Amino acid sequence: QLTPTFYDNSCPNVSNIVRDTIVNELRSDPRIAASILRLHFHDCFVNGCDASILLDNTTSFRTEKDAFGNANSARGFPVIDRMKAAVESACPRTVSCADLLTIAAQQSVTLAGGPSWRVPLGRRDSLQAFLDLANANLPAPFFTLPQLKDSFRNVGLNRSSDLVALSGGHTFGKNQCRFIMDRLYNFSNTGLPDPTLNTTYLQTLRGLCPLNGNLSALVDFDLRTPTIFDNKYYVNLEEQKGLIQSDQELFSSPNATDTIPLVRSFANSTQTFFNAFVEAMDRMGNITPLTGTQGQIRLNCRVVNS
Ligand code: HEM
Ligand SMILES: [Ca+2]
Ligand SMILES: [Ca+2]
């Protein structure tokens, strides 16, 4: 079983080294905290949190970095390399990349103003990467609520609270115009914008993402506090200001009878949201981990030990 004290003897300063690395990177890249949290999410949804997403291509298996949900989107890999090297220097062959990324995600959330907690540890690193599984398991912004629920249940998260709380990760970070073009100009082949998108915000988004414009242009997930980890994400949903389809469906989908009350509860209380986020984060971090002697303690997160 995973435990928060796993490295209290072998590498007591691991969390501090991770924090220091992120603090330093944030000065030149204010988006890195969001990027790191997302890497952990994409790691856990594919064969569990086993650092499989960090592996680069080999002639025997393809990298998950080329998955539809990661390609030209996932980022921060060199930063993970930096903290890994620092931890390896402080504590040789001790901290797995899987655990490192989990701590990095928690520290990223805390540094951005979110809750502070000690994540369960003891995960080990995968011996391969899973591109096909990543293409099948990572949810997409155009998913309906039933599809979002299916995606979470598929990896082991059955609770609507899991889905609603973890979606709160969109309280910060960036999103490409590419992913909302349909909502802005032609939703579900209706030739009209998504009716669940606030019409005033629709105008603003159309200005940032004009038709035939730069699809790679970036827009903030949270128009209220773009880089702060808080519950504003839910207040936006209540006003039909969720940025992507999957965000707004939590509040507007015909199948949202169970998610609406959660959205409201999280928008009404920061404490309720933070508590739910920590709970959901630990549940996600507990998805099919390799433990004990299974897998390895990867020295270079990009390659399997030889
Ligand atoms: C519920 C289904 C979800 C969908 C469909 C989804 C979809 C997306 C999309 C389309 C982007 C934009 C990528 C880009 O434009 O390059 C993104 C970014 C992001 N997502 Fe999600 N996401 C989901 C859940 C989550 C969860 C569970 C977390 C973490 C707890 C998370 C954290 C983030 C963060 C922080 C960013 C910004 C990353 C950055 O700016 O580098 N997402 N997501
Ligand atoms: Ca994984
Ligand atoms: Ca925010």
UniProtKB/Swiss-Prot annotation:
SUPFAM superfamilies: Heme-dependent peroxidases. The record marks R38 as: Transition state stabilizer. Pfam families: peroxidase. Ca(2+) 1 binds at D43, V46, G48, D50, S52, E64. Keywords: Calcium, Disulfide bond, Glycoprotein, Heme, Hydrogen peroxide, Iron, Metal-binding, Oxidoreductase, Peroxidase, Pyrrolidone carboxylic acid, Secreted, Signal, Vacuole. Disulfide bonds join C11-C91, C44-C49, C97-C301, C177-C209. GO terms for cellular component: extracellular region; vacuole. It comes from the Eukaryota. The active site is at H42. Glycans are attached at N13, N57, N158, N186, N198, N214, N255, N268. Binds 2 calcium ions per subunit. Binds 1 heme b (iron(II)-protoporphyrin IX) group per subunit. It catalyses: 2 a phenolic donor + H2O2 = 2 a phenolic radical donor + 2 H2O. Its EC number is 1.11.1.7. Substrate binds at P139. The keyword Ligase does not apply. Its main location: secreted. InterPro entries: Haem_peroxidase, Haem_peroxidase_sf, Peroxidase_pln, Peroxidases_AS, Peroxidases_heam-ligand_BS, Secretory_peroxidase. Its cofactor is Ca(2+); heme b. The modification Pyrrolidone carboxylic acid is found at Q1. It is found in: Secreted; Vacuole. Monomer. PANTHER family: PEROXIDASE 33-RELATED, PEROXIDASE 72-RELATED. Removal of H(2)O(2), oxidation of toxic reductants, biosynthesis and degradation of lignin, suberization, auxin catabolism, response to environmental stresses such as wounding, pathogen attack and oxidative stress. These functions might be dependent on each isozyme/isoform in each plant tissue. Belongs to the peroxidase family. Classical plant (class III) peroxidase subfamily. This is Peroxidase C1A. The lineage of its organism: Eukaryota, Viridiplantae, Streptophyta, Embryophyta, Tracheophyta. The gene is PRXC1A.
